[PDB]
Design a protein around this nucleic acid. Structure first.
Lengths: 129, 49, 148, 472, 315, 99, 149, 104
RNA sequence: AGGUA
């Protein structure tokens, strides 16, 4: 049987470069993939390798992981905006549109890493079965 | 259908050969001063040649 | 080309090998450097001394040389593909490429024109005409006021 | 290389530069490993009975004179007598091996594989045996993957546990009870899908019965097969990659004569692969010599097909080439021109066929070429549309239709009605005489008499004058 | 007789390209030389584009105006009006997906800017100079990055059956498949409300504007990579007889002949499991031919035999 | 050179060709601008569709003039249909949409 | 002929040597050439010799065969009016004015790489072959360009 | 989008709408920009006009990727289509069509 | 190709 999956949770160095792309003008995505990669240990590496026996199947599985981490990141940012509005933050009109006040703002990177870690724990739970 | 009706009426039938004679282009006139006939070797000559 | 080459480098020679030598290249560099220093003088590309007239004979000879080059390729292929011993050489020379290319030059070319034949003066002018266009000359993408 | 290049020719040369040329004995060594691979796959087919049964069926068909002898076998490693003797002893070995199924069996299998070692068969029959064994692999893996899908998606268990427990017999109820023995929840869940799994196991056993061998031996033999064609394909690809330079050198001679060089080398590579599939060193010749003719044939085929804008048959292309060569010969001999009479004399071909062939040998020209040697107008700007009816003729047709309709209106009811469907006047359909008669409930000479009466009535110089103008 | 208030221009989908097509052009054949009846199923085909002469099947079966609402089922050829041959389009099923040159070498490269990826990289990937990762896995390899031959080999050796990377237009199309527009739009909208950095906000604004515009266009980015190539009606690329050995033929006809030849050769090579070098070469063939057909002149010109002149292209 | 009927073209329907009777006179973009400068609309439409490229409209006009009637079918010039088909020949969708 | 001949074989010691050329008399005169629509041309016949040396050793002729007056094409012959008849139409070859082969030391002016100080460049224009360019940059450096690369 | 190069007529009708309405969003402020005649003709509302007399390939690509939908109402657009121009004699016709559009 | 405005 297969019940071994240790998540490499919580690190200050989980926010140190995730924005790295091999190429110019970094944008969203390719930080999501790094986010859910660094959230899993090499034990999870080997577990994913052994559990799924097909390259297209693992490919689709990684796409599903990307999709779910993106969805949870989106919902976490939505709830953060909601609680900021409930905490007294308003919408500041900049030349990009609405934002929140700096004292009420954090950053998207830590939200993404938290979402990736929670999804990593979810995948571990699905893999310890 | 109208052409078929007319050929049935007049008793005429389609010609086996179509006219392709060289006409003088409209707008020009004049006298035929010279006629050249070139028939390749191995092909029967005609009277004019 | 050789006589102009020696003329612009101020040599008493007016003849020599067509292919360049290292000395000629070095002389060209020295002359260009002297002009850069202001000692030399530039030469117009519009002076009739720098523009040469290829009459009918020279153009025909150049095109015939091109035909000889392609038939040379054919001959060199044949000399190894064909017999390396006695075989009659008329069977290995091809008249089609040379004649076809010569006919292409004389018949269908930028500088082979129907003689404008409505006056004796027209014929004389056409035969005396000098064209800056054609193969190896100037395209109409010009003006380019200098040459005009 | 990475040199801001946009020419496939350049980096094709880069690709061919990586592989180093071979020597004469290098080709022999590569063909030797190819022969080892093909002998391995032949032994794998040998251990498979059904392909041999199919081969014997075709041998029997040939003996019945229903198939060509040269479409089954080509040469042997020491003719109808040799083929008959080898197939007779081969049938004997096959039956003596099959009897051991339905120590000794291993010896019979070894002797069987040995007696196939003499056979050298046509590539088509060998490819058929390979495809049959491949579809055996496909069906075996399909049954295994069906069991996979059922046990995994219906019982919610990981793919890792299945491999250890199921493998070893794979066609019995032992693993069912073995997995149940641990009282696992998925073992209990398997009891609701056990019927489908058992039915699939029954189909697997039926497949084994069809093969006549246990499924484990099927896997062993097919894995030996797979490694066999893997080695063979690797060696063949090595040969093809190492011999690209010959293709490039041969094609560059044909490039000066029109057609893209890249297409020529691609076709030459196709011919090179064909030669590699057909190459042998038992002949004793050099591989380059054999591949040269194949590449030349491929290049000639490419020039015949993909270089002519209009299709010209290969034999017609060869006739054109012969005509051109003889024309050049006569031109350089007589020194004046190729006269059609001598061209007719040299060929068996009359001369009118010669001139029509000469017309065919020329390729179509673009309209984008300027008419008059670089006038800013193109050739296609002058081509008249001959498929368009002139408005003069369209107006004439309209007036004729109006006149015919008026004239038919000038006749009686039934006569005009018969005429309308007889010739298809003013409807988009035409009807035969008997078809009109059936609707007029009169199927006799009467309908044609009515038509003739209408014609005779139209003969009068009161209804024909209006139609007289149209036909002069 | 036709009423329409506006004209829409958009990305043609392979399905609607097949919708335009009446038949698949499978052969580069044109005519029977001596008999000028078009071949089947060549660039000129009555079975696909309609009959040559007015209202008669090109088999000698039906010659009348009566047989016009029913097509000839006794042979491939159909029977309609000849003007239909001026409007029916065809389609060619490309064995390998091919990139559209217009979306590539325009000064703003729509493929380049949609992938936010510089032009040299697309040129090298498409022309088979280097590999690109079409999604990775748990590797140290980014979702998108170009790799050379030895780098790709080292990645493959270091990382096993987790590494999805291809080369050329197939890889580009896979990348466009793996990219989702609406989800990225939502992500950018969330990030903009949270981010306060000037440069980050500018990047987010530019990308959100681009993606929202693309979504409003209602186009799928994968459509930029041509899977099926439409072919123009034959009448718009006419082949008309002319006296002597000369005949007027369209440069489009020769270009499509080259495209069909290279596509069929690619199909044959794939069926024969040809070595990777040869199949890459033939995909290069197909890409170059398609680029010349769409726009000959941005790829180092294409000339034909027996005629030294840049071939006319659709652009 | 003067024509009212004669040589049309294959790829387009612009009337031109023939050393016996030539085509019409090129009503280029300059003349289209000249008509647009006035309130010249119907004359421009005649220049564009009826007499230039609309084969159906051209035939209908000839029949109407012979019959003694002066009106036109706007139709669509065959050149524009050629343009649509040729744009569709690329990987580009172009369509005609109603309101 | 003397430029292209003798033609040396790529291995085989079978060389083709030129002797002379002879112009055949035209089969048709100017008048009948114009009437018949055929070119007014003279056949070109050339004397050539194939020489096979010692096989195989250092050079030196062993055997030689001579082809006399081999026909390698027909060249249009010039009329007394200074014209040529090619397809029954009397054509003229216009003399061409073109830059002479040699060296031109031209001045580059009007475009200065955003620096001013108009420059100089020397172009070696061959009668046949590849151009050579020696040009300057506003940094007082000299550069070589074979053709225009 | 606070930096969008937009046609002034649409901007003017939008600002008129927001001013007459109680909704004063956002906004909205604009600054007129000057473009060369080639650029102005190149960046028109209709891709047919831009593609006709200027860089055709790039304009067509931009329109296709943007999914533009030109609604005519321009002399050259209707010239290409082959209907009456919306100028002079034809202006009466198009004005009629304007009444037939967006209303029964 | 050349010539015309």
């Amino acid at each position: 049987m297969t019940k071994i999956t240790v998540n490499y949770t919580v690190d200050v160095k989980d926010i140190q470069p995730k924005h790295v792309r091999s190429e110019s003008n970094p944008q969203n995505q390719n930080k999501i993939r790094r986010a859910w990669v660094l959230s899993l240990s090499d034990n999870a590496m080997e577990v994913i390798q052994n559990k799924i026996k097909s390259a297209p199947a693992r490919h689709a599985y990684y796409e599903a992981i990307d999709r779910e981490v993106s969805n949870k990141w989106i919902e976490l940012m939505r709830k953060h905006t909601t609680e900021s509005l409930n905490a007294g933050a308003k919408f500041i009109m900049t030349s990009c549109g609405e934002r929140l006040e700096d004292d009420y703002c954090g950053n998207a990177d830590e939200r993404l890493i938290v979402a990736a870690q929670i999804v990593a724990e979810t995948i571990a739970a699905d893999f310890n079965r | 259908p109208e052409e078929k009706l007319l050929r049935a009426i007049f008793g005429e039938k389609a010609s086996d050969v179509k006219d392709s004679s060289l006409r003088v282009p409209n707008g020009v006139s004049g006298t035929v001063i010279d006629v050249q006939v070139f028939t390749r070797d191995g092909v029967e000559k005609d009277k004019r040649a | 080309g050789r006589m102009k080459f020696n003329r612009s480098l101020l040599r008493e020679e007016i003849e020599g090998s067509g292919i360049l030598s290292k000395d000629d290249i070095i002389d060209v560099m020295k002359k260009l450097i002297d002009i850069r220093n202001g000692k030399g003088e530039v030469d117009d590309i519009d002076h009739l001394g720098n523009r040469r007239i290829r009459s009918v004979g020279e153009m025909a000879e150049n095109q015939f040389r091109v035909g000889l080059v392609r038939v040379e390729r054919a001959v060199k292929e044949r000399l190894s593909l064909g017999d390396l011993d006695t075989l009659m050489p008329q069977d290995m020379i091809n008249a089609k490429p040379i004649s076809a290319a010569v006919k292409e030059f004389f018949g269908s070319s930028q500088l082979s024109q129907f003689m404008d034949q409505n006056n004796p003066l027209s014929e004389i002018t056409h035969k005396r005409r000098i064209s800056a266009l054609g193969p190896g000359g100037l395209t109409r993408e010009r003006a380019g006021f200098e040459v005009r | 290389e990475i040199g801001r290049t946009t020419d496939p020719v350049r980096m094709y040369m880069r690709e061919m530069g990586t592989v180093e040329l071979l020597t004469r004995e290098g080709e022999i060594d590569i063909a030797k490993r190819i022969e080892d691979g093909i002998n391995q796959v032949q032994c794998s087919v040998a251990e498979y009975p059904e392909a041999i049964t199919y081969l014997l069926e075709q041998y029997d068909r040939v003996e019945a004179e229903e198939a060509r002898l040269s479409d089954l076998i080509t040469g042997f490693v020491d003719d109808p007598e040799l083929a008959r003797e080898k197939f007779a002893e081969l049938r004997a070995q096959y039956v003596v091996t099959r009897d051991t199924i339905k120590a000794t069996a291993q010896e019979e299998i070894l002797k069987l594989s040995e007696v196939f070692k003499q056979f050298r068969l046509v590539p088509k029959q060998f490819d058929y045996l390979v495809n049959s064994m491949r579809v055996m692999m496909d069906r075996v893996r399909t049954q295994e993957r069906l069991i996979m899908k059922l046990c995994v998606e219906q019982c919610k268990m990981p793919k890792k546990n299945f491999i250890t427990l199921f493998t070893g017999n794979e066609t019995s109820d032992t693993w069912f009870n073995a997995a149940i023995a641990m009282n696992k929840p998925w073992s209990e869940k398997l009891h609701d899908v056990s019927e489908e799994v058992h039915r699939a196991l029954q189909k697997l056993q039926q497949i084994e019965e069809e093969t006549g061998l246990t499924i484990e031996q099927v896997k062993d033999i097919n894995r030996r097969m797979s490694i066999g064609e893997a080695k063979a394909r690797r060696a063949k690809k090595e040969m093809v990659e190492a011999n690209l330079r010959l293709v490039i050198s041969i094609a560059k001679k044909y490039t000066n004569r029109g057609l893209q060089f890249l297409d020529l080398i691609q076709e030459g590579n196709i011919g090179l692969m064909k030669a590699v599939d057909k190459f042998e060193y038992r002949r004793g010749y050099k591989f380059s010599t054999y591949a040269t003719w194949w590449i030349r044939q491929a290049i000639t085929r490419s020039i015949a097909d993909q270089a002519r804008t209009i299709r010209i048959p290969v034999h017609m292309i060869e006739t054109i080439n012969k005509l051109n060569r003889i024309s050049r010969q006569m031109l350089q001999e007589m020194g004046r021109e190729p006269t059609p009479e001598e061209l007719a004399e040299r060929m068996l071909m009359p001369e009118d066929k010669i001139r029509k062939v000469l017309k065919i040998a020329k390729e179509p020209i673009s309209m984008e070429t300027p008419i008059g040697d670089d006038e800013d107008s193109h050739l296609g700007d002058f081509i008249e549309d001959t498929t368009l009816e002139l408005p003069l003729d369209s107006a004439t047709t309209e007036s004729l239709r109006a006149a015919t309709h008026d004239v038919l209106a000038g006749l009686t009811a039934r006569e005009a009605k018969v005429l309308r469907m007889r010739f298809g006047i003013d409807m988009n359909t035409d009807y035969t005489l008997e078809e009109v008669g059936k609707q007029f409930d009169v199927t006799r000479e009467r309908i044609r008499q009515i038509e003739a009466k209408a014609l005779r009535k139209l003969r009068h110089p009161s209804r024909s004058e209006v139609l007289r103008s149209f036909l002069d | 007789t036709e009423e329409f208030d506006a004209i829409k221009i958009a990305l043609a989908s392979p399905d609607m390209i097949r919708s335009w097509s009446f038949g698949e052009v499978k052969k580069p054949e044109t005519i029977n030389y001596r008999t000028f009846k078009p071949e089947r199923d060549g660039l000129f085909c009555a079975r696909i584009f309609g009959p040559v002469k007015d209202y008669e099947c090109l088999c000698g079966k039906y010659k009348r105006l009566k047989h016009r609402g029913v097509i000839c089922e006794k042979c491939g050829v159909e029977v309609t009006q000849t003007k239909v041959r001026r409007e029916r389009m065809g389609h060619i099923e490309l064995a390998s997906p091919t990139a559209h040159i217009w979306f590539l070498k325009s000064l703003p490269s729509r493929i380049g800017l949609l992938l936010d990826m510089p032009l040299r990289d697309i040129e090298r990937v498409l022309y088979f100079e280097s590999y690109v990762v079409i999604e990775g896995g748990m590797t140290n390899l980014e979702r998108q990055q170009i790799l050379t031959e030895e780098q790709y080999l080292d990645a493959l050796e270091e990382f096993g059956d987790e590494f999805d990377a291809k080369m050329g237009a197939e890889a580009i199309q896979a990348l466009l498949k793996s990219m989702d527009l609406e989800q990225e739009c939502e992500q950018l909208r969330e990030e903009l409300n949270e981010t306060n950095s000037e440069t980050k906000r500018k990047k987010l604004t530019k990308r959100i504007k681009l993606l929202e515009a693309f979504v409003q266009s209602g186009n799928k980015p994968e459509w930029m990579i041509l899977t099926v190539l439409p072919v123009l009606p034959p009448d718009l690329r006419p082949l008309v007889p002319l006296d002597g050995g000369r005949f007027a033929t369209s440069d489009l006809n020769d270009l499509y002949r080259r495209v069909i030849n290279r596509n069929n050769r690619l199909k044959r090579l794939l069926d024969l499991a040809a070595p990777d070098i040869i199949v890459r070469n033939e995909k290069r063939m197909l890409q170059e031919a398609v680029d010349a057909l769409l726009d000959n002149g941005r790829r180092g010109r294409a000339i034909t035999g027996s005629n030294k002149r840049p071939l006319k292209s659709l652009a | 050179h003067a024509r009212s009927t004669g040589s049309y073209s294959l790829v387009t329907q612009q009337p031109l060709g023939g050393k016996a009777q030539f085509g019409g006179q090129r009503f280029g973009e300059m003349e289209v601008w000249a008509l647009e400068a006035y309130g010249a609309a119907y004359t421009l439409q005649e220049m564009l569709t009826v007499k230039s490229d609309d084969v159906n409209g051209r035939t209908k006009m000839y029949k109407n003039i012979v019959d003694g009637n002066h009106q036109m079918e706007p139709g669509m010039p065959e050149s524009f249909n050629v343009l649509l088909k040729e744009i569709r020949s690329l990987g580009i969708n172009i369509e005609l949409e109603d309101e | 002929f003397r430029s292209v001949f003798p033609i040396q074989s790529y291995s085989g010691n079978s060389e083709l040597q030129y002797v002379s050329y002879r112009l055949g008399e035209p089969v048709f005169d100017v008048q009948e050439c114009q009437i018949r629509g055929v070119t007014y041309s003279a056949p070109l016949r050339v004397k050539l010799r194939l020489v096979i040396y010692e096989r195989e050793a250092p050079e030196g002729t062993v055997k030689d065969i001579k082809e006399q007056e081999v026909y390698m094409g027909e060249i249009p012959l010039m009329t007394d009016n200074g014209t040529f008849v090619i397809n029954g139409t009397e054509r003229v070859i216009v003399s061409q004015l073109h830059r002479s082969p040699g060296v031109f030391f031209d001045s580059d002016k009007g475009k200065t790489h955003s620096s001013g100080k108009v420059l100089y460049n020397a172009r070696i224009i061959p009668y046949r072959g590849s151009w050579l360019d020696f040009e300057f940059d506003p940094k007082d450096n000299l550069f070589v360009r074979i053709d225009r690369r | 989008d606070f930096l969008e190069g937009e046609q002034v007529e649409y901007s003017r009708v939008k600002i008129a709408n927001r001013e007459l309405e109680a909704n004063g969003k956002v906004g909205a402020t604009y600054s007129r920009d000057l473009l060369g005649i080639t650029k102005a003709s190149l960046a028109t509302e209709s891709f047919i006009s831009a593609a006709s007399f200027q860089e055709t390939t790039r304009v067509l690509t931009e329109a296709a990727v943007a999914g533009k939908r030109d609604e005519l109402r321009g002399l050259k657009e209707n010239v290409i289509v082959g209907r009456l121009i919306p100028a002079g004699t034809g202006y009466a016709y198009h004005q009629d069509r304007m009444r037939r559009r967006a209303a029964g």
